[PDB]
Structure formats: C-alpha cells, structure tokens
Amino acid sequence: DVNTLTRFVMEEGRKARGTGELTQLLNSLCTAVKAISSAVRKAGIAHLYGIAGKLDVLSNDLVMNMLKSSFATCVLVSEEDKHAIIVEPEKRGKYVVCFDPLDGSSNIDCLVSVGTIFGIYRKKSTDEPSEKDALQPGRNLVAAGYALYGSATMLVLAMDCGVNCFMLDPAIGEFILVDKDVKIKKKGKIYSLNEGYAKDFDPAVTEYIQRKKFPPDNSAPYGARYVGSMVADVHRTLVYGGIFLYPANKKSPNGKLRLLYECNPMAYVMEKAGGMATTGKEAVLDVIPTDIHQRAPVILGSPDDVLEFLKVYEKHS
Amino acid sequence: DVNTLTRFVMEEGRKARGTGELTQLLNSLCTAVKAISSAVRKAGIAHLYGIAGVKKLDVLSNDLVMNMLKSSFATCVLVSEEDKHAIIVEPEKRGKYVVCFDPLDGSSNIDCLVSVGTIFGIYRKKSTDEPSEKDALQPGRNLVAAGYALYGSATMLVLAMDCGVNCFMLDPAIGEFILVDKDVKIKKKGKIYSLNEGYAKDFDPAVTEYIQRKKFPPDNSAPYGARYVGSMVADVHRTLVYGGIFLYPANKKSPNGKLRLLYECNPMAYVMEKAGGMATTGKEAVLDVIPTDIHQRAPVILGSPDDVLEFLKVYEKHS
Amino acid sequence: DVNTLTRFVMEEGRKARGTGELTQLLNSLCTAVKAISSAVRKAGIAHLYGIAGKLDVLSNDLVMNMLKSSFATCVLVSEEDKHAIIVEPEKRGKYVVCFDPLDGSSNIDCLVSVGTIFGIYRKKSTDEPSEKDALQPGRNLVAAGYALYGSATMLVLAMDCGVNCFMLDPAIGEFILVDKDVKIKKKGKIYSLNEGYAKDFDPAVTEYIQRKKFPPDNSAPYGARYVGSMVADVHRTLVYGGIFLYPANKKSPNGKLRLLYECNPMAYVMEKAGGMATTGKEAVLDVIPTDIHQRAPVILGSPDDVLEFLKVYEKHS
Amino acid sequence: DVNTLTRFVMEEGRKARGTGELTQLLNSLCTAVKAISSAVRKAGIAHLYGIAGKLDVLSNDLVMNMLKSSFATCVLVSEEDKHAIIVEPEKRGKYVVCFDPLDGSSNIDCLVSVGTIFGIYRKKSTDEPSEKDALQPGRNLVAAGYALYGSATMLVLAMDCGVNCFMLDPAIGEFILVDKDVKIKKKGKIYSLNEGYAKDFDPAVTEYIQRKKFPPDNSAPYGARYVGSMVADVHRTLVYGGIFLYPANKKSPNGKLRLLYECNPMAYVMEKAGGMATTGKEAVLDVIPTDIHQRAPVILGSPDDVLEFLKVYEKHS
Ligand SMILES: O=C(/N=c1/[nH]cc(Br)s1)NS(=O)(=O)c1cccc(Cl)c1
Ligand SMILES: O=C(/N=c1/[nH]cc(Br)s1)NS(=O)(=O)c1cccc(Cl)c1
Ligand SMILES: O=C(/N=c1/[nH]cc(Br)s1)NS(=O)(=O)c1cccc(Cl)c1
Ligand SMILES: O=C(/N=c1/[nH]cc(Br)s1)NS(=O)(=O)c1cccc(Cl)c1
C-alpha cells in the first residue's frame, strides 16, 4: 500500500493513542516544507523579474507561522532568531521545536542543495514556557529530521519507531514513503569534511584522514565528498554510509555547527538509523546546553567508521 | 524588460540574420531540459508507488534529448554518453548541426539527491559528405554553442555562445527559463579548490604539491576552502559563481583522466572560456585537443585564470 | 490563521474526541482528489504525445485505492462499478463511501468542468459487510461533498458543523480554507436545466420555467446557465443562489441522476448550506434506496426557489 | 512526431520565410497565457491566506507587458483599458493586437471556465500609430484564437493554414499540439444561448429556438448548454458542433459581446475551422468597426446550423 507522510503520522499516532498534538505539529511542518521547496525551486520567479511589468527569511517565517498556528508548540528556537520565540498564550502547546529553516542558504547562489533541519522536545514542566525549555540534551528528542531540497525534495523523519524517508511528489504536493525503517551501512567508503582547513586540524583528525587516504592494511582508499551543505552531506552519509566530520580545531574548540538545530537532530537521525554521532569526547545527544546558539563539534556516520575515528581520538588522549 | 530563453535566442537569431536552425535546436533542447527537470524532481512518483495501483532517469533523459533534437530538423549527428555509436539522424529530419551531450551527468549518485545536470555542445557540420561519426570529431574550438542544465536547489540553464555566458532560471510555475544573470564572468582568483582528495595516494606529484600549497601556503595567506559535490555540473557551476578551481587531472593509473572530452570537458571548457576563465589538460587547452574517439577521455583543470596558471606553474616545475 | 483541510479536519476531530477514522478517510480522499486534479489538468500529457520517442478509469482507481488503504472504510459504491466493493478484512474500517470519481467526464473532450462527488456513511450493523450497507437514506450521512475541477480546484466539504470550501494551491498541494460556514442565498436569480428537452418536460416544469422567463409582476426575469456538468452547476447554485433541476418526466419517472453518489451528497451539501433538495414528491435526503445505482429526480438550491417550484409542482399534482 | 506551440510557429515561420516578428509576438502571448493559467489555477494562493504570516488586472498586465516587450506590436486594445495603448516608440513593431485578457472573469467566483481571447492584425495605415489602427474588419486578421482555462488549459490558434489545438502540459510548461487542422461538424446537436432573455428575443431567434426543441421533421430535439463564459461555449461549439447565440436584447440593443476582441477572434477561428459567424445582417468579420469597445450580436457555429438560423432571419425580413 502507498503511504504518505500525513497517513503514516496518523497511524503511528493512533497506535500510540496520543492526543494528536504531535501529528498536528508534524503536518504543519510538512506544509511549511512544501512551501519552502516551492520557493527554493524558484516557483513564481518570473514575477520578481518583471513579467507583469530573503529566502532564508521566508523559510523562517513559514516555519514560524506554521508551528505557531499548529497549536502544538510553546517554544521555538531558530537559527534566524537571537532569542527563543515564546508562542502567544492562546496558540500554546506542549512542544519545543528547534529548527534551521534553510541550512546551506548562504551558498544558494550556486544552487547548492539546501535543507531544513528540525528537532522536537516535550516542554520541561508546567512553568510558563521560556528559553530554558530548549536547553535539553538530544537524548530528550521526541522526533527529529530534515527536508533536503536537492535534485528532488525529500523529508527524513526519525522517531522511536525508526527512520523513514518520504519523497515529495510535486505533481500532487504529497510526501510518498519510499524508504522504510532505514538503517545506515555498518561501514562506508566515503569521508566528508572540509580538507581545506588541514592546517588547523586536531592531530587525531589528521591521523584519521591519513588512514582514509593511505590505509596501512592494503584495502581501498575512501572517496571524499564535501558539498558544504550539512543536510546534503549528512543525507549522502545516511544513504551511502561513511563518515561526516565537523571537528573541534584549536581555534574553534566547540566546532562551527549548532547543537540545538543542526547537530542534535542529525545525531538523532543517525542513532535511530543505527549509526553514531560523537563530539569526540561524548555522544552529541548527551551534551547539556547552556545557550540556544551554542556550537558543537560533530562526527557522525556508519558505526564502524565513527568507532575507528574514536579509537584514534582515544590514542591522542 | 523580462527575458526568457526563447526570447533571447530569437533576439540573437535576428541580429545575425540566421535561418533559425540554431534557434529551433536550442528551443528543443530547452523543452527536453524542462522534461528532465520535471522527472528529476520526481513529479508523478506517487504512481510508481501504487497511489492508483517505468523508465530509469538516465535512460529517460537520453530519450528526451535524442527525440527532441531529432525532431528539431536542425541536427544530423548526435553523440550521447549513453550510446556507443553516433546516431545518424534520418534524412527527412536532417539539419546542419552536430550535438554532443550528457543527458544526465552525475546520475550514478541520484540515490542521495545530489545535484545532477545536462551538458551539451553544438557544432556545425564541416564536410560535404553523408553525415557520420567523424563529424563529431571536431576540436572544442569549433563549438558554436555549449552549456549545461543544473538540476540543483533550483534549475538553471547556462548558455554560452560567441556573445558570452547567460544564466536562465527555470520558473517551474510557468515552464519558462528566465534570464537572471547576463554575460557572466568568473573571478580572476577564487578561494576554493575542487577535486577528490580521497585518491591522494594516486595523485600526480604536481597535483600533490598544488593541493599542499592550497592547504599550507608558503606566502602564509589564508588557506583555500575545499568543495567536491562529486557531480561535475554542480562543481563547475560553483566554480563559475564563486570562482576558484576544479580539477579532474591525469595520473599514472588514468593517463588521460576520467571525464569525457566531447560531452563533458569540451562544453565546460567552452563555457569557462566565454566567461573569461581557463581550462587545461595540463599539457594543452582542452578546446584544442583533436578527438579521435567520440568517447575518449581528457584530464581537466578549469576555473579562475589565476588559480589555473598557479597549477600550471607547479605542473611545469614537475615537467 | 491560515487553515488547510488536514489541519481543519484534525481540529474538528480532536474537538469531537473521535478515534481518527473519519480523518484518515478525508485525508485519503483529499490525496486522491489532488491526483485526479493533476491528471485532469493534463500534467505529463507530453509523454503520451511522444516527447520521449482512461481518465474516468484512473479517477476511479485513485479513489478506490486511497479509500481501501485508509483503514477507515468497509463498503465502496462507485459510479464506475456494477456492484459494491467490499474492503478485504485486514483493511476494514467503519465507513461506507459512495462516490462518483469523475462526474461530467462524459464531455471532458471540450474541457468542461468535471468533479468528484462523495458521501460518507457509518456502517449500521455488525453483519458481514455487503452492498446493503450502502442502502441508507441521505439523512444518515456523516459527511458529503465534492471536488470541482474548474478554473481552479476546489473541495467543498459538508458535515454537521456546516459547509466549508477549500481551494487547492497547486504550488504546494494543500487545500486552503477560503470560505467558512457557507450559506446559500434565500432567493436566487438563475435557473439551471437542460431546456433543449422541453417537449418532454413535465407540465409543472414547463410552467415553472415559463414563470422564470415571464414573471407575472414587474420583477426581472431569471438568467439561465447550464454547464451540463452536475458539480459545476451545483457549485454555481451554491455560490450565486438559484435553482438547478434534473426533474422527473413521463419518459424518465425517476430522473436520470443517480441517488447514492450524485443527488444525496448534493442534497446534503445544500441542506447544510440552508438550502433545499427535493424529488418533487419528497426531500432527496429522505429517499430509502433499494438499488445502489437507482435514479432520482432532483431540484435543488435556494429555499425560496425550490418552495416556489414545489408550489407549481403541486398545482399539477 | 510531438509538436509544441513554439516549434509549430517556428516551422510555420520558416516555411513562409517571414522575418520572425509574428513568431516573437505569438511566443510572448504563449508565455503570458501560461502565467495566467498558473494564476487562475491559484498557484501560491496559500501566501495570500497567511501561510508565512486582482486577477483580471494581473491577466491584463501580463498580456500587455509581454506584448510590449516582444517588439512585435504598435497598438494594443484590451477589454480592460478605455483607450488603445500606443506602444512606446523604441518597442514598436508592425502588429495590432486586440485582446480580452480574462473573459468570463466576472463569474470566476464560481470557478467557471475562463479564457483569454486575441486577434492580431498587421498595421495597415502608414500614419503614426493610433486607435484607428485597431479598427479594421475581422477579414483583415492575420491570426486569432484563445486560451481556455477549463479542466485543462488549451490554446487554440487559427491562421491561414487553419485551426490547431495545443494542450498545456503544466508539468513542463509547454503547449503540446493535440488536434491538427481542426474542422467543425457540418451540423451539430446542441444550441447555446441564455434563454432567460426569451422575453426580449426578436421573432427570428424565438422561432429558431422553438425548432431546436420541437423539430418540424421529427428529428431529435437539440440539447441545450450555456456555461455563460464565451470561450467555453465557443470551444464546445468547436469541439462538438452546434450553434452559439448571443443576440441583441433590451439591455443590449447593439448586442452584448465586444466585436474587436470577442466576436472577431471567435469568428475567425470559426471560419478557418469551416464554420460560420453572423450578426444576422452580415458576417461578423465583414463588420467595419468605428469604436474599439463596440458590441455586436453574434450567432456562430456549424455551417448547417448557422444556415438554418439565417433562413429563419430571412423569413422575418
Ligand atoms: O497522533 C496522535 N493521535 C492520533 N489519534 C488519531 C489520529 Br488521526 S492522530 N497522537 S500523537 O500526536 O501524540 C502521536 C503519538 C505517537 C506518534 C505520533 Cl507521529 C503522534
Ligand atoms: O534564429 C535565427 N534566426 C531567426 N530569424 C527569426 C527568428 Br524568430 S530567429 N537564426 S539562427 O538560428 O541561425 C541563430 C543565429 C545566431 C544566434 C542564435 Cl541563438 C540563433
Ligand atoms: O479525527 C478524529 N480524532 C482525532 N484525534 C486526533 C487527531 Br490528530 S484527529 N476523530 S474523527 O475522525 O472521528 C472525526 C470526528 C469528527 C469530525 C472529523 Cl473531521 C473527524
Ligand atoms: O517566424 C518567422 N520567421 C522565422 N525564421 C526563422 C524562425 Br526560427 S521563425 N516569420 S514570421 O514571424 O513572420 C511568420 C510567418 C508565418 C507564420 C508565422 Cl507563425 C510566423
């Protein structure tokens, strides 16, 4: 039987006998994603160019509006907003969502794949909601995922039941389930990082990469892929296996990427898919945050590859 | 005024008082590219998943381009990455142009939603003889027109001709290519390098040193950033937009590189040069190589002239 | 607040504290309507004309398959099928659905508006599901409506809460709520029927139509519109007021329109809009059917006009 | 061999060895139509209804700006504008274009089919361009036709070579040629007019219609259809045969439909497809306009139908 994202969320919902609040939130987000996809693919661009005589802002506005009006959220953290948004009393629900509405967008000039990253938490207690409700480790995530706007638009959604991939059929505006209960490869053949900054690498990253290009065990060198758009690189890592790194270098002791709405959601997907995600010192999902916009170093991917990185990291102490 | 691919080509076609054969061919190419875009974006996939309840994308793309160009009445010889021999347009349908194309480059990785693209190169038929494969064995310098469609976050057609490089965005709401960047030029010098470093162990000594300089400059400037989508169209378009360098060079294991000359390297080299950039095999100009085999490979280094020169410096230092 | 069909239905569903079955059915139906729309609008027609080297049947398959896989239905009556379809046991839910997957497709050659009409009942007994479960008077309906594939695609949904119209935004495949709680005008200015067949008219219809064209007082005669496509004429009757007629006569004593999946859901929509629908002898919604494909006469629309028609009808009784 | 509007026009443009100016006019009109089609199908309506927190006017702007920018036109007349628009000198071309950018749009509240109608003349006078330039009889037309935004969008183009029908495939934004060298039936079985004006009909019309309902030879009575939107009524007349009438009445002593951009284009299409269009007095195409917004009575369709009507017009002087 054909399955759609809306249908799959409603049946998972009916199974868990929940109130429907998580379904309303996910459906609202699904609508936002289709709106973002439409804009990203430049639908209606001819009007801008004067046929009848911003994108990251629109993306944020779309996600903000869709979630507020969902009556399922109370606290919203976005890459585009210095402070958490507190949902007005009347539209309040029990969920905290942290999102990146259009990751990769500063490089949209070249039509690079971009994406939307999201993670959903249950609010902490009865206390009037505040920014603190967002300061939660990944381990608390109820659901997470992303929409990649690549050659086609795909939504990846991870929850307790696992990871499922839905392709947007733009002819009908519907996410079709194409990959069920997906699991990452145990070990891959591709590593992904910005090698351009080799100079600043932690000695362990240097040795790990060296092991990829010159294995001392006669096996084939890994290929390298690095798009520079996190959703794109993480998606390829999920689909093909391998390793993706944005490591802590001595000048950036906490990485570049953001914990709340890039690192945590991706780590949740990875683990739900049977891969791993570490900062080097600990599981990404175990980091306890003190700032909504704080950074984290991150290495994720196939378990065999991330265990191999960790083993090297342990050696260098 | 608002300009569209078709408006642009008819406009240029009139300025030069041509027959309209090249215009008819581009129009057809544009129709096939919208159809490839639609399918790449997975419109109608719900039916394949049994919503009511065929072809692989590379095959469909090939059939779309072949069939559009044939029926254009503007072509006589078609070479595709997908077909071993040149296709010889049947006589009733024959025109004066030779097209070499890769109908869906980068498709071997379409499983992870990577940016894919269509690449094309157009030649005037030289000789007087019945058309044949040999007509496609023209050096890059003979190209009347070339470019590519990139099916990325959005769809863009890049069209290069004698008058420069023009970038058209597809508005899928109306199915028009909108001219959004006129007469494009690449930066003299960029801050990105693009190649598969995974295969460093097989690098040409010259490639190894060039890359080491990018990562640890001797003049202590800031090191370049690295990017490699692994899809040529995407890597070459970024090169064109942010400047820098893209490499797919020869080594011992592949003395002639991996990328194809007629339908990948030539068209991208032509684009690069019309945008005032540089494309080299290391020993000669990509555009100057005389082909002997329609599917022959070429090493390619292309991008900002200052990066390409700097690579040649290092390549010369190693003979 | 922006509202969609999915969000609307989940909202009305949580208010009523129902299980979700109705909502899964409406979501499935809505997905089918999007697919019918895309095909009606000829998306992908270039492939059939050879760019690379049934519509009534497809519309039927889309609805049948989406409804079957909704888990919300047990008996399906279609214009297109001789007998009722009984959903296999693993898939059985509580609703009986009666539909016309592509009303008006008869004249789709001239690109006249076509539509999808549906009516939803609850199965009444715990008997094994059979055709008989579809033999309910329209008073028994839980939901009814239609999709109109016209200049735009619109979904009109009637429930106890009233009639709501949703406009499909094809950019994103969401039906947007555009008219809340619609009511028909008390009296209209438009009469709609096939006047070409006047020689066969009942003498009551003849006189009623004669009075529309030749008022006894000094009032404006009525204008006339007849698309010949039932969804289009009914939707116009809904928005502008007036009367639509496909009445009985000597040659066709039970009219020509089908009761289960044409007259009943239009009668329902009309009555929820504060309008009327009669056979001439009784309300359409009170007819007890004995055959799934039985015909009914229908005269519907503004209450003042239908009451007037009934006045004239009775004069010839 | 698949054919598209742009390709067909180029092929035709090359045969006749023309300069390409008309091809640029037509391509520009084709682009305008796709943009109107997309607005009429309400793409991006979600943004108007607050998802991120006038159509005849837009249809007019699209057609005007596309025509102006084509360099192929000098004088433009539009249903929407009081006076002829005189193209600025730097953009001037040789063609005069009369159009109704969105016909039937007054009833679009009910999602009735709408359309775009155009007629194209070569400028005949050597005077500076002015309104007079648009005042030629329809006999002078070089090309005419319409787009019908029905259940799908079709462009109908009529020129010297006859009438051709193109279906818009909105997946790729290309009009695909679907019916070549179209001919209307010699005699039809449907008549089309607003019978609500029966009180104002002159005796010839009244008699003609009587015959359609009560044939004096015991052939089958005609069916009646009247969408009330001219493009739809005329397209059906084209596709199925029969007759479409809009005679004069007390509100419209000179008739209702506009001669320049409603009656001429349709008459031209009708004549090229082997049909007829009359005012009762003379061919619509032979009427010599004096005002750009002047109206005309029109009776058009199958030849044997218009001939039968003209006989009855004769019998009443
Ligand atoms: O969807 C829910 N409940 C429902 N009941 C009926 C319908 Br239709 S949806 N509940 S939940 O939102 O809390 C939930 C629980 C688990 C998984 C999901 Cl994805 C959603
Ligand atoms: O289009 C051409 N001529 C025309 N005549 C009328 C029209 Br409309 S187009 N000629 S060409 O195809 O040979 C040509 C020449 C130069 C540039 C282009 Cl891109 C196309
Ligand atoms: O949807 C229902 N309940 C729900 N619980 C949670 C979600 Br999310 S929907 N109930 S119902 O399907 O029975 C129903 C009841 C009344 C109206 C509607 Cl249109 C739907
Ligand atoms: O198109 C024209 N000429 C051309 N030359 C090359 C191309 Br490509 S089009 N001429 S025309 O515009 O005047 C013309 C003539 C007859 C029919 C048409 Cl529809 C168009």
Side-chain angles (χ1 to χ4, degrees), chain B residues 119-172:
Chain B
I119 307 163
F120 58 87
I122 309 164
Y123 299 91
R124 222 156 196 256
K125 180 173 158 59
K126 285 316 208 285
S127 70
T128 343
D129 293 22
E130 154 82 10
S132 88
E133 189 160 311
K134 325 230 160 170
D135 292 305
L137 302 177
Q138 296 185 40
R141 296 281 168 201
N142 291 14
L143 283 163
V144 184
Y148 57 84
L150 172 63
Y151 319 98
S153 66
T155 299
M156 182 169 276
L157 175 81
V158 171
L159 181 56
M161 293 181 299
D162 274 284
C163 78
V165 182
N166 294 113
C167 305
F168 300 86
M169 193 68 97
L170 177 65
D171 189 340

Side-chain angles (χ1 to χ4, degrees), chain A residues 1-2 4 6-7 10-11 14 19-21 23-24 27-28 31 34-35 38 65-66 69-71 91 171-174, chain C residues 1-2 6-7 10-11 14 19-21 23-24 27-28 31 34-35 38 65-66 69-71 91 170-174:
Chain A
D1 287 348
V2 74
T4 67
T6 315
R7 183 184 265 196
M10 285 164 182
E11 57 186 45
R14 283 193 69 209
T19 50
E21 220 168 326
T23 288
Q24 290 167 306
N27 169 78
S28 296
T31 295
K34 301 187 287 172
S38 195
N65 195 70
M66 284 317 296
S69 59
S70 70
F71 291 81
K91 304 188 179 307
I172 60 167
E174 200 75 46
Chain C
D1 264 3
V2 72
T6 316
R7 166 187 269 188
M10 283 173 182
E11 171 158 344
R14 286 190 64 210
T19 47
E21 273 195 53
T23 277
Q24 290 167 298
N27 183 71
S28 299
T31 289
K34 290 191 295 176
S38 180
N65 172 79
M66 290 301 307
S69 65
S70 67
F71 283 56
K91 318 206 160 165
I172 57 171
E174 287 286 326

Side-chain angles (χ1 to χ4, degrees), chain B residues 74-106:
Chain B
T75 62
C76 49
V77 179
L78 305 163
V79 168
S80 179
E81 178 270 355
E82 279 291 298
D83 303 80
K84 171 81 193 181
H85 291 279
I87 281 84
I88 304 312
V89 179
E90 74 192 81
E92 294 177 31
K93 291 174 165 95
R94 266 184 213 167
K96 64 174 82 101
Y97 294 96
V98 175
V99 187
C100 308
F101 64 92
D102 194 342
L104 201 59
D105 195 276

